[PDB]
Amino acid sequence: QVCTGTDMKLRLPPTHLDMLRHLYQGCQVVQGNLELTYLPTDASLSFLQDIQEVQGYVLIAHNQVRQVPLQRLRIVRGTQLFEDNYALAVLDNGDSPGGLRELQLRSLTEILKGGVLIQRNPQLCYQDTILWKDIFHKNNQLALTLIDTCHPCSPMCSRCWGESSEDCQ
Amino acid sequence: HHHHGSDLGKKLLEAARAGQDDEVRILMANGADVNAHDFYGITPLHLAANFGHLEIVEVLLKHGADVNAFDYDNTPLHLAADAGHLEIVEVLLKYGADVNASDRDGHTPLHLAAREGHLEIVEVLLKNGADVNAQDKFGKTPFDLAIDNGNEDIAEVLQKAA
């Protein structure tokens, strides 16, 4: 149910994937920062499927994977912040080409403290359609949002995490 | 890819938010854009005004930051007035902040100071030309907000200023 996150930040890992698996497999609540970095295209991330809460910051960076199965994550508490600013940081994922296609965070509701940073993700769509102010908590309205600006959102929404009707905000 | 100006703008928003004066001044001497903003239009002046950093506000102003910049919601003067920073309000005004600017809900800073029970700021606004008759998108006036918020003293001042 519970696990420790990691302090590694942007530092180079390599066995790295195994440690991530053994760490987060089955984990619902992360008692530290969730840092997912330098993942290759063939990487199997399914062991992230149970993650619900993150007390620290979420960092997603320098990955070649096209998808990050975070669909179950409701809340980031941001008791620790990446670069002392952002609770959510998706950076440099990229180089059919590799790299994150869609955030797909269907359950993300509250970001308690800290901002959003999404930069240099050449394959990523929809990040700019999300209303982030709705997600930020009542006392978080002033955190920094810095995000780069694709098929349209599903017509069943125009704010979405991905192309599917399941991905609407 | 990374760009010089953008990274310095990022750093400047960060520092202005954190209240780091040295960083801000250095960033000024390195040519960081005083008007840089985030996805929601938040400028370093907005951050400093809101989080009560007076030194940084004065520095940005002297370096030509747009006093009347609107973000998603409001101007720096709005933030300072809502947060109860008297001196920041006074400096902001000294530098040409519009006393009557209306935010996305049609609030003026007088609206927010009256809502938040900051009396001294209400007086400074009034003395600087604030309009007591300004009506927000709810048709509500600053007197209205003071009364609705248990601010009767502020209400008396407003009533007397009309």
What are the extents of the domains in chain B? Answer: 1-162
B29 burial via Cβ count (<10 Å: 0-12, 13-18, 19+): exposed
Asked if B47 contacts B34 with a C-beta cutoff of 8 angstroms, the reply is no
Q: How far apart, in Å, are the Cα atoms of B20 and each of A64, A135, B54, B142?
A: 36, 27, 11, 34
Smallest CA–CA separation between A14 and chain B, in Å?
A: 25
C-alpha distances out from residue A59 to A56, A118, A128, A139, Å: 10, 10, 18, 22
Q: Which DSSP letter does residue B160 get?
A: H
Cβ–Cβ pairs < 8 A, chains A and B: 34
Q: Determine phi and psi for B31, rounding to 5 degrees.
A: 85, 20
Q: How far is Cα A48 from Cα A23, in angstroms, rounded to an integer?
A: 10
B17/A144 Cβ within 8 A? yes
Q: Report DSSP letters for chain A, one per residue.
A: -EE-----TT-----HHHHHHHHHTT--EESS-EEEES--TT---GGGTT--EESS-EEEES---S----TT--EE--SS-BTTTEEEEEE-------S--B---SS--EE-S-EEEEE--TT-BSGGGS-HHHHB-GGGTTS-EEE---PPPPTT---BSSSSGGGB-
CB contacts, 8 Å: B18 with chain A: 84
User: Which of A119, A144, A149 to mutate to probe the B interface, most B CBs <10 Å?
Assistant: A144
Structure token pair of residue A52: 């619900």
The two three-digit tokens of residue A46, written as one number: 């399914």
Q: Which of B17, B40, B71, B105 to mutate to test the interface with A (most CBs of A within 10 A)?
A: B40
| CA nearest neighbour of A23 among A40, A6, A46, A44 | A6
Experimental method: X-ray
Strand A53-54 relative to strand A34-37: parallel, antiparallel, unpaired? Answer: unpaired
Residues in chain B: 162
The alpha carbon torsion through A55, A57, A61, A63 (nearest 10 deg) reads 10
DSSP state of B114: H
In this complex, the residue of A120, A128, A146 whose CB is nearest that of residue B38 is A146
> Pseudo-torsion of CA A137, B8, B19, A128, nearest 10°?
-10
Residues in A closer than 8 angstroms to B42, CB to CB, are: 142, 144-145
CA-based nearest residue to A167, from A146, A144, A151: A151
What are A53's strand-pairing partners?
A: A29, A75
Where are the extended beta strands (E) located within B24-129? none
Tokens of B120: 């001294």
User: From the candidates A86, A120, A146, which should be mutated to test the interface with B, based on the most B CB atoms within 10 A?
Assistant: A146
CA distance B162 to chain A (A): 34
Provide the sign of the torsion angle of the four alpha carbons B128, B134, B138, B143, taken in this order.
positive
Backbone φ/ψ region at B42: left (φ over 0), alpha (ψ -120 to 50), beta: beta
Token pair, residue B41, equals: 């239009």
A29-30: strand order across its sheet: A2-3, A29-30, A53-54, A75-76, A110-111
The CATH topology of domain B1-162 is 1.25.40
**DSSP class of residue B106?**
S
**Closest CA relative to residue A3, chosen from A59, A51, A71:** A51
In angstroms, this model's resolution equals: 2.5
Q: How far is it, in rounded angstroms, from Cα A26 to Cα A41?
A: 22
Rounded to a whole number, what is the largest CA-CA distance in chain B? Answer: 58
Q: For residue A136, report the phi and psi dihedrals to the nearest 5 degrees.
A: -55, 145
Locus of tokens 């179950």: A72
- Could you give the 3-state DSSP secondary structure of residue B68? coil
Kindly list the residues from chain A whose CB atom is less than 8 angstroms away from the CB atom of residue B38.
115, 144-146
Domains of chain A are 1-169 (3.80.20.20)
* CA–CA distance, B67 with B158 (Å, rounded to integer): 26
Nearest to A144 among B38, B51, B72 (CB): B38
Distance between CA atoms of residues B119 and B114, nearest Å? 7
Q: Which residues of A63-100 are buried (b: 16+ CB within 10 A; e: fewer)?
A: bbbbebbbbbbebbbbbbbbbebbbbbbbbbbeeebbb
Per-residue DSSP letter, B139: S
CB environment B115-134: b (16+ within 10 A), e (fewer): bbbbbebbbbbbebebbbeb
* Contacts of A159 by beta carbon, 8 Å cutoff, 6+ apart: A129, A130, A131, A153, A168, A169
CA–CA gap between residue A32 and residue A70 (Å, rounded): 16
